[PDB]
């Protein structure tokens, strides 16, 4: 199995180009993601309601936006 | 970087062109100046309707980016104040990906730019200057700058690039950079080394483009 990360970004009080702000907000959000463990007793898959592990991303590649 | 192009392959369109680079083949078409819709009317300048469709499937958000990037290039080129309150339909259809369309869209972007500009010439629209776009890539291992790469060269590439420059005075003097796209891991030294080889190769295609127009336009006159 493999994890898939869906994201939803809401923007309020738009003034100028928001791509720079949407990226930065997404980066901060990605810095703190916890992936809940899964288990199984065609079979389905069940995620644990408690146990989870922190998402490991490359901090060396982490960038930020500016216009 | 041997390419091939034709002018005026379509009949019912005001202007059209067919660009070929490696395996990626993008045919373009231009109709204008024509009557614009109420929602597209611009009292002073000229309206631009840009449409880019892929080789497989339906146009998605990916192609919406291609249209947006293509718009940034064709906008300063066309003299908008020559056709007040009018419309120009620019449609670019990609016949073949010529790459991995899922991972890279920068090869097709340059071809969409090249084909569009040629169609603008054929349709007889007011242009402030000329333009030429080339795809660039940097391999992770060799760390060399390759102008107009192939499909297999992109898969092992570390960073992909896209350069489009505006040319004046016999296709020699560069007025301003129209489009500069870059994706992947790269430093500042690789950037100025990219324009050093890019501007040289861009002018090579500019003078290459210029002779294509001469061979096609002159017999009509």
């Amino acid at each position: 199995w493999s994890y898939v990360l869906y994201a939803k970004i809401v923007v309020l009080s738009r003034t100028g180009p928001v791509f720079d702000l949407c990226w930065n907000s997404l980066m901060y959000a990605l810095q703190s993601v916890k992936l809940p463990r899964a288990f199984i007793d065609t079979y389905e898959i069940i995620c644990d309601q408690t146990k989870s592990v922190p998402l490991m991303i490359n901090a060396k590649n982490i960038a930020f936006a500016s216009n | 970087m041997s390419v091939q192009a034709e002018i005026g392959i379509l009949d019912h369109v005001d202007g059209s062109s067919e660009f070929v680079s490696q395996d990626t083949k993008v045919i373009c078409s231009v109709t204008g100046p024509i009557e614009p819709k109420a929602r597209q009317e611009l009292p002073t300048q000229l309206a631009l309707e840009i449409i880019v469709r892929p080789a497989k499937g339906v146009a998605t958000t990916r192609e919406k980016v291609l249209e947006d990037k293509l718009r940034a290039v064709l906008t300063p080129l066309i003299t908008r104040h020559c056709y007040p309150r009018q419309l120009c339909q620019i449609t670019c259809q990609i016949l073949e990906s010529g790459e991995d369309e899922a991972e890279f869209s920068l090869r097709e972007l340059s071809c969409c730019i090249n084909a569009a500009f040629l169609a603008l010439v054929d349709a007889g629209i007011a242009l402030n200057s000329m333009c030429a776009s080339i795809p660039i890539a940097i391999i992770k291992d060799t760390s060399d700058i390759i102008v107009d790469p192939t499909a297999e060269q992109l898969k092992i590439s570390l960073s992909v690039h896209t350069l489009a420059l505006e040319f004046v005075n016999g296709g020699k003097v560069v007025k301003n950079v129209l489009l500069l796209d870059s994706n992947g891991d790269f430093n500042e030294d690789q950037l100025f080394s990219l324009l050093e080889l890019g501007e040289q190769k861009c002018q090579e295609l500019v003078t290459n483009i210029r002779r294509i127009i001469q061979d096609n336009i002159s017999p009509r006159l």
């Binding site: - | 009317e41 009292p43 002073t44 104040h81 007040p84 309150r85």
Partner: protein, 124 residues
């Protein structure tokens, strides 16, 4: 937009009473902004019959006018007959050139490129 027998515009701001103005905030790329129409007979008191609309206004030019009748619930009817009304801010070649200023009532010049375009100017 410019037509032959009239000239339609859109309302941006309205002058207050005793200068100060009241800016009407709206989207110009939708059409929610109030639209108004200036008749060819309401251009100037001088020679009301024959008036060349091309030599009076221009697409993009700012025009200070006074509303006569509201008419229907779509377009407002303005006029620039008096001296303090006419094209205020404008640029050369539909906005492509440099800024132009108002000198004569029927002539607008640009003290930058030396360009002169025929407009309907107001009194400073």
């Amino acid at each position: 937009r410019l037509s032959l027998q009239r000239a339609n515009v859109e309302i941006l701001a309205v002058e207050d009473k005793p200068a100060t103005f009241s800016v009407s905030q709206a989207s110009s790329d939708l059409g929610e902004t109030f639209r108004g129409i200036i008749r060819s007979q309401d251009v100037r008191s001088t020679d009301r019959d024959r008036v060349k609309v091309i030599e009076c206004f221009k697409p993009g030019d700012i025009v200070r006018a006074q509303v006569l009748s509201l008419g229907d619930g779509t377009n407002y009817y303005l006029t620039t007959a008096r001296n303090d009304l006419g094209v205020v801010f404008a640029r050369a070649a539909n906005g492509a050139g440099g800024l132009m200023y108002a000198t004569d009532w029927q002539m607008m010049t640009s003290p930058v490129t030396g360009a002169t375009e025929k407009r309907k100017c107001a009194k400073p």
